[PDB]
Amino acid sequence: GEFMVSIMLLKVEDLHVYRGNREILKGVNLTVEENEIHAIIGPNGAGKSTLAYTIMGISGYKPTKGRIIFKGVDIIDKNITERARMGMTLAWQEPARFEGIKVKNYLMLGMNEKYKKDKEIAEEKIREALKLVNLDPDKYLDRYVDETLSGGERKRIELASIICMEPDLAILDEPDSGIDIVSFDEIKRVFDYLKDKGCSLLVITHREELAEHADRVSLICAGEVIKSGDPKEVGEFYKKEC
Amino acid sequence: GEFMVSIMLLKVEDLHVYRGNREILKGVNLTVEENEIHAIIGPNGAGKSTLAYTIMGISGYKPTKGRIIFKGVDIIDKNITERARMGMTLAWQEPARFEGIKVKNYLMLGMNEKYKKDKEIAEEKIREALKLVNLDPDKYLDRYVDETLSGGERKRIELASIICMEPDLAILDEPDSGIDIVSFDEIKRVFDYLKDKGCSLLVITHREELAEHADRVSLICAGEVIKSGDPKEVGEFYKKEC
Amino acid sequence: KGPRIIVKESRIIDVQGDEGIILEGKEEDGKIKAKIIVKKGYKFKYPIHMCFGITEENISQIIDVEIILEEDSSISLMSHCSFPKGKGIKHIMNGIIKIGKNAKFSYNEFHYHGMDGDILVKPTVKVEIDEGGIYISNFTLTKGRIGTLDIEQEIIAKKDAIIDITTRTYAIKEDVVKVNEVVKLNGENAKCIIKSRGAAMDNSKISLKLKIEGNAPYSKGHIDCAEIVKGNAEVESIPIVVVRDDKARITHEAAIGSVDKKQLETLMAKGLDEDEATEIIVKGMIGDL
Amino acid sequence: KGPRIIVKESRIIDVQGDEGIILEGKEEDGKIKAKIIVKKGYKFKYPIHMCFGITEENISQIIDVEIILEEDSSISLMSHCSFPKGKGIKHIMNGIIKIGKNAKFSYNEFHYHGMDGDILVKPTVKVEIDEGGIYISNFTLTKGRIGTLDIEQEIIAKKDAIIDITTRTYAIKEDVVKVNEVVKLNGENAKCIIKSRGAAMDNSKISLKLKIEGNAPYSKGHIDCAEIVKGNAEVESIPIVVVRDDKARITHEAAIGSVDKKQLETLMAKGLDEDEATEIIVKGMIGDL
Ligand SMILES: Nc1ncnc2c1ncn2[C@@H]1O[C@H](COP(=O)(O)OP(=O)(O)NP(=O)(O)O)[C@@H](O)[C@H]1O
Ligand SMILES: Nc1ncnc2c1ncn2[C@@H]1O[C@H](COP(=O)(O)OP(=O)(O)NP(=O)(O)O)[C@@H](O)[C@H]1O
Ligand SMILES: [Mg+2]
Ligand SMILES: [Mg+2]
């Protein structure tokens, strides 16, 4: 649909993604508007991860039918670096471990130009991001983002990376799982911080309770967007239909 | 305390567990009564896993001070097999993958004597357990409990193993995480099934929402049981104190 | 009754080949010369058989076979060895396999032996895979006493080839297992996996030399080795990885010795004793479970 | 100014040893004979230094050193090599290390070289560890042209010993890296870890032979190898695992070739191009980041 495209950041039109002989996404229609926290709910194996990797341009996740438009440009021929330079980034669910990369240097990668420039401002933005994800900056700044960290520490550092990057679109694959969340008030405090800065979040989750804190929610069932709109209406449909 | 011990299945008295130079558990007092779903809440690194491994008798998790009494017997000198033969079992959080062990043969391991005996009854109990954890029995019975399964499939098969085993005490390390839970109604249906059979569950969790469905809840903070009792009272204290 | 090659003792009992599958066979007194040719386009989805039976004392079953698969062809071979008497036996197979452009070959060899270890199973297989070809190999020796196993394979792969080699062994008493496999990924995007699984007990001796050469761009390889050690068994694992391209990637993982502590403790939490739990892990390892 | 051994060119500049740390040193014209003895009970927590500087052409710095640590002693040695001229240089170290009952030795060698590769660094280290002993070794050559590296180590460990050996290398131009380490866990509960990290570019040649022998009950070992390949570099990894006890367990993991796809794609999702992302992974791999 080309109505209200002037306020649309991302537009996935009838997307078909195949992984070998199997079709995972069977016609995905999804849009992300400016300054919106749009959540995606669905059961295990519905294609939540597949969709997130296809938008980011991860190798192997190539669409057969359909198009992905970001910032009015069809990114069909754009690679991961080119899509990231447009303002789009991804969380993963299991953030990759890196040999010999310190947290202080990792949080500088992809950092927004409004922080990256001044030295004393970039170093302060790192502290603000680590304090937001409940990590003691002095206890983690000189730690490596390697296998040595716990899954919760590494996923919290990935959330802090999103904060330092401050992207136009942040695709977050299961931000509340892997951190063994105590309460949604801690994840909401990060989501609201990014939203106040002008970011749009494409939060991928299986937890209906997390989706209720988003502005809009889309239910993906077997590679198709069944219901969309109000988080509580589509949430009530998710509790009954499968 | 030796008052009301006649209705106590498990009794952990002032338990101190060290992992090298660090003391993880610093005096744990916890009891599990008969036919009780007793949940344990706490932040990451509080010693939830350590406590679960010490009760099960996992190597390396040896108490320096304090005692663990199960069924009136001090199990200080009992190994994992001996504790399991008393009716105590554990879930792990990340259930181990096994080379060449089918789901149909894995679910027979440790199976309760009331099912294990009759052939047609043992084979039916497996189907009932897999149907309870929302897995299609015919799609998983001949699958291996190896790396090939997803984390959700392997943890659901571990939940089905608990069902077939029907232990007197089932220690469940994070039963709702790793399965990417859609709703608590699916985990409650399994918990109530075990409770109706006469089982006691020692559910280890970080999710306060999961603990409210238990009979009693104990809050572990830095190796110590701070508050205990009503799930909503200790839950309100967990939201504020850390 | 099915396209099969029967060899009882050191003599060919039967040699019958169907349409599009040329099966030649002759004897040079003890030495059997076979030649299998799968014609261009012929994709047989039903498996061909190859039975080897030895019940006589002092038999030297030496078979030289050449398997050629033409462009776009497909065949699956299921070799069966039954050596129950096991006194003075020697099954030696020397093979040359040539898989054509977009052809697919699959081989599965199972052994059933007696309790005496005077048997020597010695397969030597050279495999040449063309652009788009597929090779799947599986050798399983977990029944009775192996005796002395000496497997040697060398695979050369061109553009877009796929190789999957597996070995499942169960060595007992004074058994000797020797496995030496080399896979050379010499074409763009050629992929390979070498998997070794097994258990060694009593006074057995295992030597597993598995090698992958990543010589072309986008060639990928993975060696997965796992061998349980019980009693006075000795195991030696030598997994060589050579990389001659900046766009090639090979990884290897191995675990030799006692069973994993978490796996043992998980089964002991089910009420199984240390011996029952180890036996379950070992049975699953060798494919019995 | 600190307990140190200075060697500029092929001559000993200084030989000073403190209380409880006997430092002997002599010259046999080009050959340096050193002997370090840590006395029983002496646990020095501050690191000893050992500087090797070479600025002259055609220098053969051959040093034979013997390091003995008596029961319950402790020492950390930080060797520094600065070879900026690099024409005709040859640093050869032949060492015999004997770690006593409950003693602890730690060695860290760093190299800073120039851009000419006519340097040959050749350490040969024999280590003998008694009941309860600890050996920690770290060799890092990531600055300038390595030239030709030839490391050879053989460690023998008794009851309750702990070994941690690490190698970080960055091979460029026509560099040659040869690492041959063998660890024999010959005592109950002896534990070992051999870790190799590095990046090979241009026309470099790497050969890494890392071996662990699990010869006693409860002995554990782990080999972790990772080497990035760029340009026309060639890498060969040969990680041998021998197990001679049913209660011993050794595991090994290796990744040779191009950088991990998920790691590259994670950094490219941060806006970094393929070259910037690879450079970040390589810099972190060699310890620069
Ligand atoms: N490595 C793989 N091999 C085979 N199939 C895969 C692989 N990765 C993903 N798939 C397929 O992708 C689909 C799952 O989509 P995905 O979006 O990853 O899951 P999901 O619904 O997000 N669940 P979760 O991963 O728990 O968050 C299934 O049809 C899988 O078969
Ligand atoms: N392998 C290990 N090495 C070092 N410390 C460990 C290890 N395993 C556990 N610990 C310690 O155990 C404590 C964590 O307790 P544990 O019960 O595992 O965590 P938890 O609170 O349950 N969190 P979670 O694991 O997310 O459920 C910390 O003090 C860790 O340092
Ligand atoms: Mg996912
Ligand atoms: Mg845990």
Numbering used by the authors:
A (entry chain A), B (entry chain A): -2 to 239
C (entry chain B), D (entry chain B): 28 to 157, 474 to 632
Paper text:
The present study focuses on the ancestor SMS from the hyperthermophilic archaeon Methanocaldococcus jannaschii. Biochemical and structural studies showed that SMS is made of a SmsC2B2 heterotetratmer wherein the SmsC subunit hosts both ATP and [Fe-S] cluster binding sites. With respect to the six components of the SUF system, SMS has only two components, SmsC and SmsB, encoded by the smsCB operon. The SmsC subunit, consisting of a RecA-like domain and a helical domain, contains all the structural motifs of the nucleotide-binding (NBD) subunits of the ABC ATPases (i.e., Walker A, Walker B, ABC signature, D-, Q-, and H-loops).
We set up crystallization conditions both under oxic and anoxic conditions and we obtained crystals of SmsC2B2 in both conditions. To obtain a nucleotide-bound structure, the crystals of SmsC2B2 grown in oxic conditions were soaked with 10 mM adenosine-5′-[(β,γ)-imido]triphosphate (AMP-PNP). SmsB and SmsC assembled into a symmetric hetero-tetramer consisting of two subunits of each protein related by a 2-fold symmetry. The SmsB subunits consist of a right-handed β-helix core domain (residues 33–289) connected by a short linker to a helical hairpin that serves as an anchoring point for SmsC, analogous to the coupling helices of the transmembrane subunits of ABC transporters. The first N-terminal 32 residues of SmsB are disordered and were not included in the final model. The two SmsB subunits tightly interact through an extended dimeric interface, which together with the two SmsB-SmsC contact interfaces stabilizes the hetero-tetrameric assembly. Most of the interactions between SmsC and the nucleotide are similar to those observed in other NBD structures of ABC transporters. (b) Close-up on the binding site of the AMP-PNP/Mg2+ showing residues surrounding the binding site of AMP-PNP.
